[PDB]
Amino acid sequence: MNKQRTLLISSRGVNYRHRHLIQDLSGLLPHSRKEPKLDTLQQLNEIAELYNCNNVLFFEARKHQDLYLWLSKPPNGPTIKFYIQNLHTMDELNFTGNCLKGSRPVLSFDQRFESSPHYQLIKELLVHNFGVPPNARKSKPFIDHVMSFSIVDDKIWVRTYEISHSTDISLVEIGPRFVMTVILILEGSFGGPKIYEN
Amino acid sequence: TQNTIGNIPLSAYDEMPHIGYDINGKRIMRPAKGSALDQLLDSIELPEGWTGLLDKNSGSSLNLTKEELELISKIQRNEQTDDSINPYEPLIDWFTRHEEV
Amino acid sequence: NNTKAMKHALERVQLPWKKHSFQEHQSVTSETNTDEHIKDIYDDTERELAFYKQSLDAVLVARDELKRLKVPFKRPLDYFAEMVKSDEHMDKIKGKLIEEASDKKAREEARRQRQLKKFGKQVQNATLQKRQLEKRETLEKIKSL
Amino acid sequence: KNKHDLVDEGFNRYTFRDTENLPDWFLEDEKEHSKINKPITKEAAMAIKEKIKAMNARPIKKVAEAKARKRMRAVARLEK
């Protein structure tokens, strides 16, 4: 019943670490239509229109240390500008554990996401955008990891834990551990007046 | 895909009676138990679309269709890939039709 | 910051999850956890454990609801499918873990071998004289009878 | 790559060329120099070496003769 597709795009100005985030998210998401590079705002709807994308992850970097994810629904959806502060990529050696490449995750959430309609919208968009469809073409059956989402100090801390089994269950943390500071929410996709500000 | 095992080597499953698992978890069984005669025949007079690699769906050798083999040859001798087109269309003068004042 | 258009956005974007199976959604909300109960908010040691507790909660609930349906949960150890981190990458991590374990054991045996070089002489002469004490002990135990 | 992808790639620098009416002394100079250097793999070179290898390529005779060569080499390095 749920049928979705993500577009993973980049901007010129993305460094080493941020490139590894597009690598590892394209790994974890089986419905990730990975795209190389974009140069410029309005074009991204049309890219999504070509590949039949239900979602568009636009990773921007203005100053080369920064990262700004522009999560969106293409045709008329409310796009969300983030600023991602902390970063620990997939290829950091302290993390131990193999998730299946693009298996169905389990989305974990928080109480304070239902506190406002504001955090309710990002909660929903993280469910179907950062999540998975039940029958994605590159998706692996037996469920093997989670997506831990939790808010503290007005920012959502994202982690991906591989579940560990013994013969009841453990779970060792891996993958992109990062905060998401909700900067801005537009009314339409990359156009129209701004709904939310900080 | 319907075999759902990625860029892993098919060295694994050579000792199994199945090639991997698929969406909604069930056993993709290896399709046939061929004769030793047929296997020796396919190492002397190799199959039509023989490609030397192993299929992901089944342990059997991945062959090619007649149409694909035709398409590879038509790339290498250049021979017009997309048919139902004329190589020599009449120059339809879409701009000189209307005289300038 | 008008919540009106936000609710209008929730009208268009959302899909009915309660009107369908869990498998279509697969999102255990860990409501009743605000994660503001954590002491040492900028120290990230209690915070790691608190996030771990939240994750483990959602895993157990998802295990229950997914077991309620006839869809399997565990990795069978019978499909060797493609994983996120490559095998050479996993050999790098495992290499590092065995390296750190060998370094810890190296410092433990360092204390051991240094003690053997310091008190090796005393070990020699004590064991030898104790052996001779045992010689005279046994010989006295024969000479008495 | 599927059929649809190769049909795109098929339109080269060298498409839309007549070949049947033309004299041979012209085509034998075109066909030598009409080869677009597409990237290869080791994976393909393996199979094409496995495709060309014929039956009498490695009999018992030539295996025994190969060892007869290497024994003579192992003797020639004790001649010094």
- What are φ and ψ of residue B29, in 5° steps? -70, 150
Which one-letter amino acid corresponds to residue C84?
A: V
3-state secondary structure (DSSP) of residue B29: strand
B26-B27-B29 Cα angle (round to 5): 145
Task: Tell me the HSE value of B100 on the side-chain side, using a 13 A CA sphere.
Answer: 2
Task: Tell me the HSE value of B82 on the side-chain side, using a 13 A CA sphere.
Answer: 13
Q: Taking CB atoms and an 8 Å cutoff, what residues of chain B touch C72?
A: 25
Other residues' Cβ atoms within 10 Å of the Cβ of residue D12: 13
- In order, the DSSP letters of chain A are -----EEEEEBTT--HHHHHHHHHHHHH-TTEEE---B----THHHHHHHTT-SEEEEEE-SSTT--EEEEE-TTT---EEEE----B-TT-TT-----BTTB--EEE--GGGSSSHHHHHHHHHHHHTTT--TT-TT-BSS--BEEEEEEETTEEEEEEEEEEE---EEEEEEEEEEEEEEEEEEEETTEEEEEE--
- What does each C-alpha distance from C88 to A125, C47, C92, C95, D42 come to in angstroms? 35, 31, 6, 10, 21
Beta-bridge mates of residue A34: A8
User: What is the token pair recorded at B1?
Assistant: 């895909």
Task: Tell me the HSE value of C4 on the side-chain side, using a 13 A CA sphere.
Answer: 1
Asked if B52 and D34 come within 8 Å (Cβ–Cβ), the reply is no
Q: Does D63 touch chain B (CB under 8 A)?
A: no
3-state secondary structure (DSSP) of residue C137: helix
Q: Does B25 touch chain A (CB under 8 A)?
A: yes
Residues 6+ apart with CB under 8 A from B19: B3, B5, B10, B13, B28, B30, B56, B57, B58, B59
Q: Taking CB atoms and an 8 Å cutoff, what residues of chain D touch B67?
A: 3
CB B74 within 8 A of CB B81: yes
In A64-123, the residues whose Cβ lies within 8 Å of chain C are: 73, 76-78, 90-91, 93, 95-96, 98-101, 104-114, 116-118, 120-121, 123
Q: Does A143 touch chain B (CB under 8 A)?
A: no
Residues 6+ apart with CB under 8 A from C90: A98
What span, in angstroms and rounded, lies between the C-alpha atoms of A145 and A106? Answer: 7
Query: In this complex, which of C57, C76, C82 lies closest to A101 when CB atoms are compared?
Result: C82
Residues 6+ apart with CB under 8 A from A177: A86, A87, A88, A157, A158, A159, A160
- What are φ and ψ of residue D49, in 5° steps? -80, -25
A161-C88-A170 Cα angle (round to 5): 25
Beta-bridge mates of residue A38: A11
CB A14 within 8 A of CB A59: yes
Other residues' Cβ atoms within 10 Å of the Cβ of residue A174: 23
Beta-bridge mates of residue A11: A38
Give, as one character, the DSSP assignment of residue B49.
T
User: What is the token pair recorded at C104?
Assistant: 């810890």
Which one-letter amino acid corresponds to residue D75?
A: V
Asked if C80 and B12 come within 8 Å (Cβ–Cβ), the reply is yes
CB A55 within 8 A of CB A129: yes
- What are φ and ψ of residue A191, in 5° steps? -170, 150
What span, in angstroms and rounded, lies between the C-alpha atoms of A109 and B47? Answer: 55
CB A42 within 8 A of CB A189: no
- In order, the DSSP letters of B53-81 are SB-SSSSSB----HHHHHHHHHHHS---S
Q: What is the 3-state secondary structure (H, E, C) of C15-74?
A: CCCCCCCCCCCCCCCCCCCCCCCCCCCCCCCHHHHHHHHHHHHHHHHHHHHHHHCCCCCC
Q: Does A52 touch chain C (CB under 8 A)?
A: no
CB C102 within 8 A of CB A192: no
Query: In this complex, which of A101, A141, A142 lies closest to B6 when CB atoms are compared?
Result: A101
Nearest CA among A149, A174, A169, A183 for reference residue A69: A183
CB C99 within 8 A of CB C92: no
Other residues' Cβ atoms within 10 Å of the Cβ of residue A88: 16
What span, in angstroms and rounded, lies between the C-alpha atoms of A78 and A186? Answer: 6
What span, in angstroms and rounded, lies between the C-alpha atoms of B40 and B55? Answer: 19
> What's the maximum distance between 2 C-alpha atoms anywhere in chain B?
83
- What are φ and ψ of residue D23, in 5° steps? -70, 150
Asked if C80 and B7 come within 8 Å (Cβ–Cβ), the reply is no
- In order, the DSSP letters of C56-122 are HHHHHHHHHHHHHTT---S--SS----BSS-HHHHHHHHHHHHHHHHHHHHHHHHHHHHHHHHHHHH
Q: Chain A: give the shortest CA distance to residue B19, in Å.
A: 14
Mutate to test the interface with A, among C36, C41, C65, C85 (most CBs of A within 10 A): C85
Give, as one character, the DSSP assignment of residue D7.
H
User: What is the token pair recorded at C108?
Assistant: 């433990």
Q: Taking CB atoms and an 8 Å cutoff, what residues of chain B touch A142?
A: 21, 25
Other residues' Cβ atoms within 10 Å of the Cβ of residue C58: 23
Asked if C31 and A111 come within 8 Å (Cβ–Cβ), the reply is yes
What span, in angstroms and rounded, lies between the C-alpha atoms of A95 and A104? Answer: 20
Give, as one character, the DSSP assignment of residue C143.
H
Dihedral, C81, C86, C91, C92 alpha carbons, nearest 10: -160
Answer positive or negative: Cα dihedral of B22, B27, B33, B39: positive
User: What is the token pair recorded at C105?
Assistant: 């054991």
Other residues' Cβ atoms within 10 Å of the Cβ of residue D47: 14
